[PDB]
Structure formats: structure tokens, C-alpha cells
């Protein structure tokens, strides 16, 4: 029914904001509720291994590939102008203030934005997440709080590693594959980036996603209906919403500081 | 009634998200601890070819403010530029002449204000009476450099 | 009031259809650009760099956008059709047009120059006199190779 | 134990080079095996609705956002070069030559590279596929062949729509808030875009990691084990497809700058 | 059902529209706003920066697109083959086809004059006279060395 | 287990080292490139293209950067505050700083031409003699309308 | 034995990826028929400031070929440039001079070729003996600014 | 099945170590003894567009590189050092070394005119007579501001 079709559309629209409110309530209860008996730093270490260290190969190979792509592309574009000796400035500018954090968002929200959701989802749907409440250990401060704290402090480091490897792998193609002066590359690079305006800007732009990607990647896993299909649908809702959030919040955070 | 609280918090946070409009949201464009308010001023020119809004109005080179309006008067067909000047500088005499200079050789054309000399400073919300136009390439070339040869 | 909350579906559609209209609102006009623009025509001898939608200017400030360019098959001259803002309507007929250059490299934009006479315009009329656009050939071919 | 770890690493190295073989044989059996009794075009339409039309609301908004980002950024890096008019010849180059086609891969392989493998793995887990061979219908050419054909002909259209919306967003933000002359903007853009080396280049660049994203999104779901198996296979395909988007991006742009 | 087919058809049409838009409204090709066009040959003693896909023009309005350049293996001249929109064919044969640098540092395009009122054209014929391509050398190799 | 704890530690330290490498080997940050040196003031008539962090120089080789631009409201002139390399402490007071464009169209920097005097520098004193920056308008506006 | 076939076709696919498609190496462009067969030409100049490699060599503006390399003739202490010409255009006489020209006003310096006047055409592997050097903003302004103005 | 399991494992490890060794070899690829490039000094009165690692050349072709620039504390003038490929070792001392501008706007480089004929060089010596780089101001400041 068309009127019931609009009813269902409005229902989904209100469900979205209801879920957003439930999600921020869940994040509040997770980050600063109380110190549960089972809580410890070993949790954070295990998750930092499950979220960051496992996501190192993907992000490093991505950095190398996207870096040599950025270089081999700009060198063509700069060849017509003649300032190819400034290619090093280009990759260190785009892959460090815009394409660095954005791609490492689209990618950290792909591996650890889906692995996290599927993991704690399969937790919820095998009662492993409920059986923690019977033992008394609040699941938030034990199952998700280390996920949140291992996403907050592992996506910025991933973005830094990604930008470093991308810059280096852009040099490795501009220099030893397309032949520009390596010294010129590095020199013209470190004269036009203005750390306090581009490097720290990219780091803040990456932190804001790190907060908004590991929050909608662990909520969407703590909220999926407990079945084998609700989980396979949540590990797609989280990738969609996290790529969308990376893009949108990067648009905001670059309009906030050009 | 948990949906009530969830929707309440969801709206209270979607507001804080749309509290990031970020489209001329901070009408002051420097920081949260700089000078702040600004004075208004107008000038009537014969040609304002390159005075695109949000440019720079300066004195002796140091930026003083930005152009806000580029209006045109219907009666005299002269462009009326409405700019603002930072609060720190408020001591420019009325006889000061505004002239449009070209930054470098091709850079954005800015409006400088060469100080004349008088005691009465300004109303800072009033207009300028004198000026010097913006030398456009075509009219200049055709008139003078063509006239020599 | 949940059956009443079908109205939020309309709150979203009217908020999305408004976004759609804003997507087609790309004209740069609220009260400033044109409001309700009006036609005028001009005949130049050379319009080298006045590709369509370029800003027209009186005393520098923009007035409208050149709506189209035309090669009048009769005399092979450039008849440009340009739109003018509503509020600006005191432009006399003897106000002649000329092709200035954006800065020193930017693409050419046309401007008008008030000459001053009683009969203002007709907004569908045309401009008779004008000064053509310069060209780095005639300038050195007819004025550098000519006397030097 | 070192020696057992080296044995396991060699085993994984033989597996990944054998999986590519099994995946290639699966693709072969899927695309040109025979004509199964239950196939048709209705399947292609249905899976084109699940792969493409459901993945419109993500990549269109992504195109808008990355377009205004590309413009609002280049203009800032060009405000100091004096050529703030070349923005048109940028948001129609970066968002066309490399970033626009690539991000559509990094994103299509997140919405329809993961939902595809979940929908085609949970099928294997709920016995759907195994219950299709008993009806006589070849599962490959009924369940996975329409996925492949809905990924081949819906990622390039996604990339084209993404690039169009990105160009228009870069325009809207380059003219409204940045004040760049719309005329010179569209002029420089239309002039320096060189169709045969940028538009068709982006399109073939998109077809490559369409064929390669829908291939490893469908296979990774036709070869997964249980809910824990699929919940891992979807992560595996998201990772492998982002990797094969970026790697194929490098390899392709090296063959045509 | 049918909503499925309508949705997928709309999506396919949107994809094809996006492809055609990226082609035409961004680059432009044989397909596009322009219809049929006729070729014309011309002989320049030099075509310094003239590349394909220039803007052959008259009085500023675009007349078409240049198609091919060649060094005539007999006279060592620049044979330029260009396209002219059929919207304008009234141009005379006995005109001058000059090259002009756009603005100050724009693309070196081709302009043509009006050749009186003689036999109009064959649209596939050649041109008689043309002003060669100016460069920095033919100027600053005579008027800065062998002059004041 | 400590079997993986080093892995987390190793790659966290790797991330932090990468942050430091981005902040140091790409930006020349406060690790030490030029020491803690003292400022010097200069009074000009026009500082148009004198942005912050310009390249204050002598004989072409870099000396340091300008820290601040100011409009001293008393005489309405340009107060530029620039840092001088501390080891370079032989710049006499009679030396004059002039605003020069870098080469032909580079950013407007200031360069200090040595005058030569016994007393050298307070490193915090002001300069007196200078040649203010040129401006196209005043330049072509006073040497084209009168001379030729 | 099926795993053997799987790993075999896997190696085959990896070979199809690496050998045929990757390695970004030697050009087979028209290596069978309809080729260009670029041929070398030497030219001695006095200043080749903006004639870096991969530039353009042209006659009357239409590109004739590209510049292969540049070097310093140790004995002459002058610039030597080696550039290629397509075998289709083999009608350029010997006394045809080369000249460094600037594209537009700022476009990179290419090598134009002014035709000669002898009947001996070329060898396409020979040299060019007479030419005109390039300009340089400093020596140029250094000549006619303080000698014919003051 | 196991005699070749760890065999292919070690084959892959060898391939990976070869790849890592290929990656590491960028920084200091094969510089060794700087090939056959040896230092030589130069003095100038003003070197504006001469930054580190600039270009040096003779007759246009690159001769080597521009090593470093500095300010001598005594004469308050600019010293610069450059590395010269030994393939050219016939550059006499009376050879001049001026500053030129790449094309017309490209970054300033150092060109060397071979000069006369005398004792050649020790590649570690110091060139003596030369001409500085033009600065825009003084030109228009003494040829326009004074003569025309
Ligand atoms: C020109 C105008 C156009 C510009 C539009 C602006 C868009 C702004 C960007 C949109 C955000 C995308 C998020 C998508 C997620 C979603 O839809 O949300 C969808 C889900 C609910 O969906 P379900 O139906 O599946 O439950 O909600 C959530 O997951 C809740 C978490 C969302 C978090 C939102 C972002 C918070 C911002 C925090 C910033 C402050 C950080 C600073 C800390 C240091
Ligand atoms: C993956 C990402 C790929 C992006 C790389 C694509 C390069 C295309 C360059 C577009 C602009 C070309 C142009 O006109 O560039 C020309 C300009 C200036 O020339 P003009 O002044 O003559 O217009 O050259 C420059 O100095 C800047 C070049 C473009 C800068 C864009 C850098 C990449 C954008 C990434 C966002 C951060
Ligand atoms: C114009 C040319 C036309 C282009 C032709 C397209 C080529 C297609 C090749 C795609 C290969 C993927 C096959 C399917 C994979 C699969 O399903 O197989 C999936 C299996 C998974 O096995 P597991 O079960 O063990 O996880 O293996 C993979 O995950 C493969 C990872 C995909 C990575 C592809 C990247 C290729 C490019 C690499 C860059 C090279 C580095 C060099 C840089 C210096």
C-alpha cells in the first residue's frame, strides 16, 4: 500500500534516529560506566592485536599501492607543466591530508570494521555475549570496551603507517622508476607541507574517523539480531555506514580546515 | 518507553551533528581568541573588475579585512564595494584614497587604502569619497600604448 | 501516535525533495544575481574568448551571464545574447560594450560602459556600437611589425 | 616451533596459489559452462537489483562527498599557485583518472562485495545450494552466474554515476562557496580532459576491478564453511577486494598514465 | 515482480546517462550537440602549437574542430585539415586562415577572416593564404638583434 | 601471552615512529633546523606580498623567515618582524632591507643588502632604510601615462 | 589429484597475470607491421637549456619526432643533442638548420627544423652542422638593455 | 609431498627476501664515490632562485648538480658549491659561471660559459669571475625608474 509504503519509510527513518540514540547510549555505557571485575589491560592488548596488527598487511600494501599510484599519476599531470621536481610535494600533500586518512578509513572500516562487527555479532548470537552477564562481568566493559579502545588508538597509527609507506612508495616510483632527483624529491617535499597545518590536520582527521568507525563497527555488532543472517547483514551495514561516515566526516573535517 | 529515551538522545545528538553546518558558521574567520568584531566601510569606484567577494582589503600591504559586498548603484552606475576592517585598526583618516592593486602580476586583485592626512578619522560605517580605479588590460592598451605607436 | 508518525515520512520526503530542488537550484541567485533576468543582444567584430556563461560586467561588478554566442550568417560577425539582472535596468542605449580580459590571463569577459542618453533600453533590443576583443596577433602584426 | 611454522607458511603459500586455481575453475564453470534448465534473465535482473540498485544510495552520496572534498582541497592547494580556475580540470581528473574509479571499487566491494558473499555463503550454510543440485539445477549457473553478471555490468555504471555526481559536487562547491568563475571552471574542465585518455581509461580501469571484485566476492562465498565461516569470509572478501582494487589500480595506471 | 524491473531499468538508464554525460558534457566527441560538419584543408607555413581538437573559429565563435596536422612531404608545409559546422558555410574561399594564441597563454587555435563575396566554398576544398604561426624566435631574433 | 604482546608493542611503536618520521623527516619541525635566534624589525611603505614565514635573505642565500606583519597605527606603515640566523650576527644597522619578487613571479620575499657600518646589530632593533615593494598599478600608472 | 590440477591452473593464472600483463616492459608496438622505424640525427648547439629528454622535435610545427638524449661534446665544450625522425619523413635536406623554440610563451622548449637548400637530403644517422642557438632571459636582457638603452 | 612443501616455502622466502632487498636499495642506490663528480666553488653577489640541489649546466646540457649555498661572514656575499661530472674536464678557470632562468619562469640554475683557454681545473678549485642573477626590482628600479 502506498500509504503504508510511506508508513514503512517513516518507520525506518525514525528507527534510524532511535538506533543512533541507542548507539550513543551504548557508547556512553561502554567508555565510562564502571570498572568491572574481569576488566584489564590484557583485553586491550589482545584486541589491539586482533584489530590493528592483523590489519597491518592490508594497510601497508594499500599504502604502497596507493602511493605509487598517486606518484605515477601526478608525474604525468606535472609533466605537462614541468614541475615534476615537485612530485614529492604532491603525494606528501594528498596522501597525508586527504587520501591518506580517507583511504585508511575506507580500508580499516573494511577489515576491522567488518571483522569487529562479525566477531562480536557471532558472540551475541552464540550466547557467549549473554553468558558474560550471568557471571556478572558486564559485557560492555569487557567485550566492546577493549574493541573501542583498540579502534581509537589503532586507526590513527594505521593512518600514520599508511601515509609513511605511501610517501615512500611514491618516492620509490618517482625516483627509481620515473627518474627524478631523489634529493629534490625529499627537499621540495619538506618545504611545503607545514606540519601544523597538514600533518597534524591529517592526524586529527584520522582520529575523528577512528572514533566514528570503531563506534559504528562495534555497535552494529552488539545490536545485530542473533542469527547467522542478522550477522551477515550487520557486517554489511557496518561497512556501508562506516565508509559513508569516513567520507562524510572527512568532508566536514576538511571544510573545517582547508 | 525506552524508545522515548533513545529517540530523545538520538535527536539531541543529531542536533550536535547538524551543529556542524560549517558553511560560514563562524562569521569571524581567524580564531576564538582574536580581536572579534569589525568596522564597516564603503567605496565608490569606476571599475571593480577583479574585486571578487571574500578578497582582501589592506593598507600598506598588511591585510586589514575582506570585501563583503560588490553592489552596483542604479543612479550613477558606479560600483559600490562594502568591506570591513579589523577592530585593531580604526584610525584611518577620511581623505584616505582607496585604489585597486593587482597582487604580484596575476594574483587576486586586492583593494589598498593609501592614507592621506586629516584629524577626523572616520565614522567606520560611512563611505569613502575619493578613489583610484583598477587598471584593466584592454582599456589601457587600446587607449595609451596604442596611442604612442 | 505511531500511526500519526507517518508524518515523519513526509518530514523526510519534503526534506529530501527540498534537497533535490536545491540540487537543481544551481543558479547563484537569491536576490542578487538576476531575480528575473532579461535579454539583450550585442554585435562584435571578434569575440575570441567569451565562451558561454561568462560574467558580464558594468563598472566591473557582474550583471548577468552571456547566454549564447552566434555567428550571424549575414556578415559573419559575433552576435552574443546575454542576460541582465532584473533590478539593473537604467542602462542607456548608448552604453557601448567591449571585451575586457579577466586580470591578465583569465578568459575574456564582456562589459558595458554607460554613455548616457534618455531612452534606456527595451530588454529585447540590441547594442549597436562596441569595441572588439584584442588579439596578440593584430596587436603585434598591425602595431609592432607595422612601425618597427 | 620454528619448523612447524615454516611448514604452515608453505602450506598457506600452496593454498593461496591453489585457491586462485580453484577460483578460476569456478569462474569458468560459472560463466560459460552450459545452459542450466532454470536460468533466464529474471535472475540477472533480480541480482542486478541486489548488487547495483541497492548500492546506489551509498556510492551516489560517496560521489557527492568526495567531489566536494576534491574541490575544497585542490582549490586550497591551488590558491597558492594562482590557477584557481584549474579546479575544473582537477575534480574531473582525480575523480575520473584514479580516485573516482578506485573509490567505487573500495566501496562497491564493501557494500556488494560483502553482501554478495554473505548472501551466497549463508546459502551454502542453510543448505540452499546443496538443495539446488538435487532439483537438478546447476548452482553455479543459477546462483552465482547472475551475481557475476550483475557485478560485471553494475560496477562500471556505478563508477560512471559516482564520477558524474562527484564532478557536479565539485562544481557546486567550487562555484557557490569558493566563488570560482563557473564559466572558466567548466571551460578549463571541458577543454583539458582528453576523452580517449581519461574517460575511457577510467571506464576500462573500472571494468577491470569490477570483473575482479565480483569474482572474489562471489567465490569467497561459494567456498566458505557455519555462521563463523561466513562472518570471516565476508571480511576476507572485503580485504582481498580492496587489495585487488588498489593493486589492479597500480598495474593499470602503470600501463596507461 | 515489476518494481524490480522498473528499478533496475532506471539504474541502467542512469548509468548510461552518466557515461554519455561524462563523454559529451565533459569532453565532447563526434556525437554531441553539433550535427554534420564538412572538412576543409589549409596550408600554413608553420603551426607552432596547433594540436588536434583545437577551436577553429571566425570572429570568436567556434566554427568546428581541427582534425589532422601533417608535414607535406613535398613542400614541407603544415597541411592542417579542420572541420566546419554546417550551421555556417557562407564563408568565402579567398580568406585568410590565421593562427591566434588564445588570450595570452591559451591554446593556439585557428581563426579565419571573411574573403570578400566570391564563390562561397566547396567544403572539402583548400585555402589560399594564411598567416604563419608566430613564435618568440621569429620576433626576438630580428627585432632585438637586428634593430634598435 | 607475551608471544603476541610484543607484536602489539612492536607495531604500536612502529606507528608512533611513523608519526615521528612524518613530523620530522617531512616538515623540519622543532627537533632543530635553525637554533633559537632573535627577531629584528623593519619599517616599510608597502608589504603587499610579504606573507608570514617569508624567506628573508642576504645576497640571495637564505637568512631566515619573517615572523609577523603589522600595521603600526601611528604612521600607517608596514612593521615586519623577521628572524635572523643567530650565527649570522654581522649585519650592520646601515644595511637596508628591500622587498623583492623571487626571480620573475615568485613570492614576494625581503632581502637585506649590506650597507656596512661598525655597529652591527641589537637583534631586536628596527631598520630604517628600505626600498618598498613595487606595485604594477602605481608603476605602470606613473611611467606610461607621462614618459611615453 | 584434483588439488594438483587446481594448483596447476593457479600457477597458470599467476603466469597470465605476471608475464602477459605485468612487468611493464619492452614495447611490441606494431613490431610486426605498420611501424615507424625512428632514425637518429645529431645536432650541435650552443645552449639547450630547456631541451630535456622526451621533448618534441618538429618541422613547421607538426611533430616530426622526439629528442633521444643530450650531452656535452667534451672537445667542443658545446651541447650535442641526438633526436629521432620517423622514416616516413626522409626529405629533410642537410643544410636544414635546427633551432630551439619556445612553445607559445612559456611552453617547454622544443626543437624546430628549418628546411635547407641543397639537394643532398639526409642519412638519418648523420648530423646537423649549422643551426641557431637558443635564447636565455638573462643573456638576452643582458645584451639589449644596458647597451642600447642607457 | 613434504620434500617439496618446505622447498616451495623456502623458495617463497627467498623471493620475499629478494623483494625486500630490492625495496631497501633506494636510499643510496649506487652513489659510491659520487661517480666522477668533484667539488668546485663559486662566488656571487646575489643568488635568488638558487636553492639546494639546484641545476648546473654548460651549453644547456646538465654538467652536474648544485651542492650547497651559504653566506661568507667576511665579504657578506654568496658562496655556492657544485659537483661536475669528470666526463667534462676541459673547463678552464677563465670560464665564467652566471645564473640563468630555466625557459622563462623555471627555477634558476647556474650556467657556465667555457671562457678562454688556460690551465683547466683541479676539481676542488674556485671559479673567480662571473655575473649575478638579475632581480626584478633593480632592473625596473634603475632602467625604468631612471632612464625611461
Ligand atoms: C551539502 C550538504 C550535504 C552534507 C551532509 C553532511 C553529512 C555528515 C556526515 C554524515 C555521517 C555519516 C554517519 C553514518 C552512520 C549512520 O547512518 O548511522 C546508522 C546507524 C543506525 O543504523 P541501523 O538502522 O542499522 O541501526 O547509526 C549508528 O551506527 C550510530 C553511530 C553513528 C555515528 C554518527 C557520527 C557521529 C559524529 C561524531 C563526531 C564527533 C567526533 C569527535 C570526538 C573526538
Ligand atoms: C588517487 C588520487 C589521484 C589524484 C591524482 C590526479 C592528478 C590530476 C591533477 C588535477 C589537476 C591538473 C591541473 O590542471 O593541474 C595544473 C596545475 C596548475 O596549472 P594551471 O595554473 O595552468 O591551470 O598544476 C599544479 O601545480 C597542480 C596540479 C594539480 C593538483 C592536484 C593534485 C592531485 C589532487 C589530489 C587532492 C588532494
Ligand atoms: C587490460 C588488462 C585486463 C586486466 C585483466 C584482469 C586481471 C585479473 C587478475 C586478478 C587476480 C585475482 C584472481 C582471483 C583471486 C581469488 O579469488 O582467490 C582468492 C584467494 C583466497 O584464498 P584463501 O581461501 O586462502 O583466503 O586468494 C586471494 O585472496 C587473492 C588475492 C587477490 C589479490 C589480487 C591482486 C592482483 C595484483 C597484485 C599486484 C602485484 C604486486 C606488484 C607490485 C610491485
- Tell me the three state secondary structure of residue A113: coil
Which ligand is located closest to the Cα atom of residue B19?
1
> Among residues D175, D151, D158, D162, which one has the least CA distance to residue D94?
D162
CA F3, F8, F11, F16 torsion: positive or negative?
negative
Contacts for H110 with CB less than 8 Å, ≥ 6 apart: H42, H50, H54, H55, H56, H57, H66, H80, H82, H97, H98, H99, H100
Contact by Cβ (8 Å): E132, E44:
yes
Which ligand is located closest to the Cα atom of residue H23?
3
What is d(CA B49, CA B100) in angstroms, rounded to the nearest whole number? 9
What is d(CA B79, CA B47) in angstroms, rounded to the nearest whole number? 7
Contact by Cβ (8 Å): D177, B29:
no
H window 23-42, beta carbon within 8 A of A: 23, 26-27, 29
B window 96-125, beta carbon within 8 A of D: 104, 106-107
Ligand 1 centroid to Cα of residue A212, in Å, is 8
Chains in contact with G, where contact means 3 or more Cβ–Cβ distances below 8 Å, are D, E, H
Ligand 3 centroid to Cα of residue D113, in Å, is 15
Which grid cell sits at H66?
648544485
CA H114, H116, H120, H123 torsion: positive or negative?
negative
B13 vs A contacts (CB less than 8 Å): 20-21, 24
**Is F135 in Cβ contact with B135 (below 8 Å)?**
no
How far C3 CA lies from chain E's nearest CA (Å)? 26
Query: Is the minimum distance from the CB of A94 to ligand 2 under 6 angstroms?
Result: yes
Rg of chain C over all Cα atoms, to the nearest angstrom: 22
Pocket of ligand 1 (CB under 6 A): A 15-16, 19-20, 23, 208, 211-212, 215-216, 219-220, 237, 241, 244-245, 248-249, 252; B 17
CB atoms within 10 A of CB A13: 17
**Is F5 in Cβ contact with A53 (below 8 Å)?**
no
Q: Say if C8 is an interface residue toward chain A (CB within 8 Å).
A: yes
Cα G138 to Cα G143, H54, H96, H100: the distances in Å are 8, 17, 14, 6
Ligand 3 centroid to Cα of residue A88, in Å, is 29
Contact by Cβ (8 Å): A190, A90:
no
Give the count of alpha carbons within 13 A of G125, CB side only. 3
Ligand 1, pocket-test mutation among D65, D68, D72, most atoms within 8 A of CB: D65
Which grid cell sits at D183?
564559466
Q: Whose CA is nearest to atom 30 of ligand 1?
A: A20
- The CA angle D8-D12-D16, to the nearest 5 degrees, is 175
What is d(CA D179, CA D65) in angstroms, rounded to the nearest whole number? 19
What is d(CA A178, CA D68) in angstroms, rounded to the nearest whole number? 31
Ligand 1, pocket-test mutation among A17, A21, A22, A23, most atoms within 8 A of CB: A23
Query: Is the minimum distance from the CB of A182 to ligand 2 under 6 angstroms?
Result: no
Ordered DSSP codes for chain H: --TTHHHHHHHHHHHHHHHHHHHHTTTTSS-TTTTTEEEEEEEES--SS--TT-EEEETTEEEEEEEEEEE-TTT--EEEEEEEETT-----TT-EEEEEEETTTEEEEEEEE--S-S----SS-B---------HHHHIIIIITTT-
Q: Say if B30 is an interface residue toward chain C (CB within 8 Å).
A: no
C-alpha torsion D49→D50→D52→D55, nearest 10? 130
What is d(CA D153, CA D140) in angstroms, rounded to the nearest whole number? 18
In three-state form (DSSP H/G/I as H, E/B as E, the rest C), the secondary structure along D105-155 is HHHHHHHCCCHHHHHHHHHHHCCCCHHHHCCCCCHHHHHHHHHHHHHHCCH
Q: Roughly what angle, to the nearest 10 degrees, separates helices F2-24 and A41-51?
A: 70
- Tell me the three state secondary structure of residue A88: helix
Q: Say if B58 is an interface residue toward chain F (CB within 8 Å).
A: yes
Q: Whose CA is nearest to atom 30 of ligand 2?
A: D74
Which grid cell sits at C127?
547594442
β-bridge partners, A63: none
- Resolution of the entry in angstroms: 3.5
Ligand 3 centroid to Cα of residue E109, in Å, is 47
Burial F4-38 (b: 16+ CB within 10 A, else e): eeebbeebbebbeebbebbbbebbebeeeeeeebe
β-bridge partners, B147: none
> Among residues H68, C12, H109, E18, which one has the least CA distance to residue A15?
C12
What is d(CA B112, CA B58) in angstroms, rounded to the nearest whole number? 5
Ligand 3, pocket-test mutation among G21, G23, G25, most atoms within 8 A of CB: G21
Q: Which residue of A2, A5, A14, A17 is the best one to mutate when testing the C interface, meaning the one whose CB has the most C CBs within 10 A?
A: A14
Contact by Cβ (8 Å): A37, B22:
no
Contact by Cβ (8 Å): A146, A44:
yes
Beta-strand ranges (E) seen in F5-90 are 39-44, 56-58, 61-64, 66-72, 77-83
**Is D172 in Cβ contact with C55 (below 8 Å)?**
no
Beta-strand ranges (E) seen in B22-108 are 38-45, 57-59, 62-65, 67-69, 79-86, 97-102
Contact by Cβ (8 Å): G39, G125:
yes
- Spatial strand order of the sheet with G127-128 comes to G67-73, G78-85, G39-44, G127-128
For chain B, the residue count is 149
CA of A237, closest atom in ligand 1: 25
Ligand 3, pocket-test mutation among D244, D245, D247, D253, most atoms within 8 A of CB: D244
How far C50 CA lies from chain E's nearest CA (Å)? 8
What is d(CA E56, CA E62) in angstroms, rounded to the nearest whole number? 6
Q: Which residue of D41, D46, D47, D49 is the best one to mutate when testing the E interface, meaning the one whose CB has the most E CBs within 10 A?
A: D49
- The CA angle A36-A39-A43, to the nearest 5 degrees, is 155
Which position has the grid cell 569487557? Answer: A142
β-bridge partners, B43: B81, B128
Burial A178-193 (b: 16+ CB within 10 A, else e): eebbbebbbbbbbebb
Method used to solve the structure: cryo-EM
What is d(CA A166, CA A174) in angstroms, rounded to the nearest whole number? 12
Q: Is D159 exposed, middle or buried (0-12, 13-18, 19+ CB in 10 A)?
A: buried
Ligand 1 centroid to Cα of residue A117, in Å, is 17
How far A23 CA lies from chain B's nearest CA (Å)? 8
Cα G24 to Cα A69, A166, A167, A196, D250: the distances in Å are 14, 21, 22, 39, 11
Which ligand is located closest to the Cα atom of residue A27?
1
DSSP-derived secondary structure letter, E89: -
Amino acid at each position: 500500500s502506498p500509504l503504508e509504503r510511506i508508513r514503512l519509510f517513516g518507520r525506518a527513518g525514525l528507527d534510524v534516529v532511535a538506533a543512533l540514540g541507542r548507539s550513543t547510549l551504548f557508547l556512553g555505557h561502554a567508555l565510562l560506566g564502571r570498572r568491572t571485575p574481569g576488566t584489564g589491560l590484557h583485553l586491550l592488548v589482545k584486541q589491539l592485536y586482533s584489530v590493528g596488527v592483523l590489519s597491518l598487511a592490508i594497510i601497508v600494501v594499500s599504502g604502497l599501492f596507493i602511493g605509487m599510484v598517486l606518484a605515477l599519476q601526478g608525474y604525468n599531470i606535472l609533466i605537462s607543466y614541468g614541475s615534476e621536481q615537485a612530485v614529492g610535494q604532491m603525494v606528501a600533500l594528498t596522501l597525508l591530508r586527504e587520501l591518506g586518512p580517507v583511504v585508511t578509513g575506507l580500508l580499516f572500516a573494511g577489515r576491522a570494521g567488518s571483522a569487529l562487527t562479525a566477531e562480536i555479532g557471532n558472540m551475541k548470537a552464540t550466547e557467549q555475549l549473554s553468558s558474560l552477564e550471568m557471571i556478572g562481568v558486564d559485557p560492555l566493559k569487557y567485550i566492546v570496551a577493549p574493541r573501542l579502545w583498540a579502534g581509537f588508538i589503532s586507526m590513527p597509527l594505521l593512518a600514520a603507517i599508511f601515509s609513511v609507506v605511501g610517501i615512500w612508495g611514491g618516492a620509490m616510483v618517482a625516483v627509481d622508476w620515473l627518474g627524478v632527483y631523489e634529493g629534490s624529491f625529499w627537499a621540495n617535499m619538506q618545504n611545503s607541507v607545514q606540519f601544523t597545518e597538514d600533518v597534524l590536520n591529517g592526524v586529527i582527521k584520522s582520529i575523528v574517523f577512528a572514533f566514528v568507525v570503531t563506534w559504528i563497527a562495534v555497535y552494529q555488532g552488539y545490536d545485530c539480531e542473533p542469527t547467522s543472517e542478522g550477522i551477515s547483514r550487520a557486517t554489511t551495514r557496518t561497512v556501508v555506514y562506516a565508509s559513508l561516515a569516513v567520507l562524510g566526516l572527512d568532508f566536514i573535517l576538511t571544510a573545517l580546515m582547508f | 518507553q525506552t524508545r522515548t529515551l533513545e529517540i530523545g538522545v538520538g535527536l539531541f545528538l543529531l542536533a550536535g551533528l547538524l551543529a556542524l553546518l560549517l558553511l560560514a558558521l563562524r562569521v569571524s574567520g581567524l580564531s576564538v581568541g582574536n580581536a572579534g568584531d569589525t568596522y564597516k566601510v564603503y567605496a565608490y569606484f569606476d571599475n571593480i573588475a577583479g574585486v571578487t567577494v571574500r578578497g582582501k582589503v589592506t593598507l600598506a600591504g598588511v591585510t586589514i579585512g575582506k570585501v563583503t559586498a560588490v553592489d552596483l548603484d542604479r543612479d550613477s552606475y558606479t560600483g559600490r564595494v562594502t568591506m570591513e576592517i579589523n577592530q585593531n585598526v580604526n584610525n584611518l583618516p577620511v581623505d584616505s584614497t582607496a585604489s585597486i592593486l593587482t597582487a604580484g602580476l596575476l594574483g587576486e586583485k586586492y583593494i589598498g587604502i593609501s592614507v592621506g592626512g586629516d584629524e577626523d578619522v572616520l565614522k567606520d560605517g560611512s563611505t569613502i569619497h575619493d578613489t583610484q580605479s583598477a587598471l584593466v588590460l584592454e582599456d589601457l592598451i587600446g587607449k595609451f600604448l596604442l596611442n604612442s605607436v
